[PDB]
């Protein structure tokens, strides 16, 4: 009798394949045929933030577009003023193998974690003037790969245990678990509503999650290797994944199909990070060949290069207001580009 | 306000100068083969932080990259090992480590443990590795087997090095192990420098 469910699966899969082939009228390359080309982009390094001792795994801006937090596996969480290149804070982390770090939309807290399977929440604006540890979210069984604040009290996190978790910070409680991936979740990305979020894993697929119902709503496949980076498009109706197969791919949420692929024969390295511009027509991808390529996310033509790092570009970040781009790297520097 | 900013910056920069002088006086090791257990030891007033990454789920190809700039990876193996072929698993792992883009300059300290358990076993190795019958040493039985495994690892190792990294195999006493890691890290640093000056 076990064949009944195999037949249900076989049938359902066929229906989904057919309903995804039928709603494919044209290719983005086509309706995108008569638009202008970006015009080759030439950004210059405007700032070099120095002070980190070892490779910079992560960074995140903060909703003022001036301050930024960076995480270095020397064991430091450095909060920099970007306008004056001044260090506002330097937090010694309890564990040095940090892989992610987040800046709260309110400015009061930062978060970081890594191979310790904990998300530490540090307070920035206290009565005794010195930043202290405020909370420690425990429960994951694999390294923290990404964390993001929903607000002062809630935080989402992705782990190398194939699971995402939504926490309440006051009670230090894992209020929701998100399961379904079969490989390490390497990146998460909140939608501008903070009601959904996509995650990308080492099973070569991305999943969309409702934050309140705790249910996977869509799965996306089409890469050939691990998805290392994922970034929501400015409007939330699509997202972009970057992979070890040396490609980026743009997926749509209302079509459930891969819309676009960004790749060149010259490029045979992996994509480490991605991020959109403020309008979303430029796609910035950091690579393992020490460079950052700027893709025309609508024409899929490589629009430019940022080539000022001596080691692996590890983290991208665009300001909330779109003024500057931040690149961290394994050369232990941050570069601010315009 | 900019005056206060410069004040805080100068204070932080003093602190960071101290931190920088502490960070280079310590050497980081990766032990291989809750999320991460740290160990700290001191030999001859040189400080070492070893890191055991037990606490992950057996798929290493992403978090291994965290250790691209350690002084060494200490790779422990059991020459002794419904019986799987575990020595071949260790060889395949060593080979994927040796040839990874981000660990190519990392010297590996190979520890071959349970040698006495092996010697107990060898009086079931010719089935796997059928070349063991023609192997010649460069209780002879135990020594031949042990050095055969060592030479398997060294054959993987001496193929794609290019001089940038080496293997330092030993047969394994926390005392002598600590001393051996000390000496091998000294040799790794010396070789990196001697290769910088085109002497090696």
């Amino acid at each position, epitope marked *: 009798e076990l064949d009944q469910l195999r037949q249900e699966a076989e049938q359902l899969k066929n229906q989904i394949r057919d309903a*995804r082939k039928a709603c494919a009228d044209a290719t983005l390359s086509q309706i995108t045929n008569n638009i202008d080309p970006v015009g080759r982009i030439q950004m210059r390094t405007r700032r070099t933030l120095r002070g980190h001792l070892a490779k910079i795994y992560a960074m995140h801006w903060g909703t003022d577009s001036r301050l930024l937090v960076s995480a270095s596996q020397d064991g430091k969480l450095i909060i920099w003023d970007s306008y004056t290149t001044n260090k506002v804070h330097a937090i010694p982390l309890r564990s040095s193998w940090v892989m992610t770090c987040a800046y709260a939309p309110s400015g009061n807290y930062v978060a970081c974690g890594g191979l310790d399977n904990i998300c530490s929440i540090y307070n920035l604006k206290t009565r005794e003037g010195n930043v202290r540890v405020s909370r420690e979210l425990a429960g994951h069984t694999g390294y923290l790969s990404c964390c993001r604040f929903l607000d002062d009290n809630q935080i989402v996190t992705s782990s190398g245990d194939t699971t995402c978790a939504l926490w309440d910070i006051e009670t230090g409680q894992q209020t929701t678990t998100f399961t379904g991936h*079969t*490989g390490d979740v390497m990146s998460l990305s909140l939608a501008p509503d903070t009601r959904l979020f996509v995650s990308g894993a*080492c*099973d*070569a697929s991305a999943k969309l999650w409702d934050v309140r119902e705790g249910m996977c709503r869509q799965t*996306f*496949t*089409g890469h*050939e*290797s*691990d998805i290392n980076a994922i970034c929501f498009f400015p409007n939330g109706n699509a997202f972009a994944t970057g992979s*070890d*197969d*040396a490609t980026c791919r743009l997926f749509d949420l209302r079509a459930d*199909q*891969e819309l676009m692929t960004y790749s060149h024969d010259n490029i*045979i390295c*992996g994509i480490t990070s991605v991020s959109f511009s403020k309008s979303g027509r430029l796609l910035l991808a950091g690579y393992d060949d020490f460079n950052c390529n700027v893709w025309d996310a609508l024409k899929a033509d490589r629009a430019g290069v940022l080539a000022g790092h001596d080691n692996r570009v590890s983290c991208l970040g665009v300001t909330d207001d779109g003024m500057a781009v931040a690149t961290g790297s394994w050369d232990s520097f941050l570069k601010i580009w315009n | 306000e900019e005056k206060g900013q410069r004040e805080a910056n100068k204070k932080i920069e003093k602190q960071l100068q101290k931190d920088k002088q502490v960070y280079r006086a310590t050497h980081r090791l990766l032990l291989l083969g809750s999320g991460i257990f740290e160990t700290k030891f001191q030999v001859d007033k040189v400080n070492f932080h070893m890191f055991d990454v037990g606490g992950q789920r*057996d*798929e*290493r*190809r992403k978090w*291994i990259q965290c250790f691209n700039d350690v002084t060494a990876i200490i790779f422990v193996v059991a020459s002794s090992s*419904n*019986q*799987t*072929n575990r020595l*071949q*698993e260790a060889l*395949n792992l060593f*080979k*994927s*480590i*040796w*040839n*990874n*883009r981000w660990l190519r300059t990392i010297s590996v300290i190979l520890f071959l443990n349970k040698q006495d358990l092996l010697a107990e076993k060898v009086l079931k190795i010719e*089935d*796997y*590795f*059928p*070349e063991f019958a023609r192997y010649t040493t460069p209780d002879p039985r135990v020594t031949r087997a042990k050095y055969f495994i060592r030479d398997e690892f060294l054959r993987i190792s001496t193929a*794609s090095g290019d001089g940038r990294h080496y293997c330092y195999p030993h047969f394994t006493v926390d005392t002598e192990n600590i001393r051996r890691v000390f000496n091998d890290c000294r040799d790794i640093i010396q070789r990196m420098h001697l290769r910088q000056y085109e002497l090696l």
Partner: nanobody
Amino acid sequence: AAQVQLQESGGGLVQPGGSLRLSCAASGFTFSNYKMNWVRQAPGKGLEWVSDISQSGASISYTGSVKGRFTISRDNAKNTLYLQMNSLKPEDTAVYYCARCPAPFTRDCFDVTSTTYAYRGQGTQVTVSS
């Protein structure tokens, strides 16, 4: 959309000493940029790496127990992987998966025996007995 599929076939019963040819069809990736593996799992055992072949088809590696007996081959034209098995022994009875290496253009192959690896196939059965 597309997906990474590795479909084994050609497995069945066979007498001790017989011969079979396992055929793994591949889809979802450029078959040539990747190194390929044969892994197996017997009753009550972990996963075992059996054989590997490289992007071109020249570099070849075997586990010791199937050397002289098994022959891995690749066909980039027809995207196929083959394992020829002759002089079979009963201790080969098992499920046989064709695995891929995670990343293309690489010489290292991490995590092909992990019990959860994503780029493996569902396997084919081989039963050597009376």
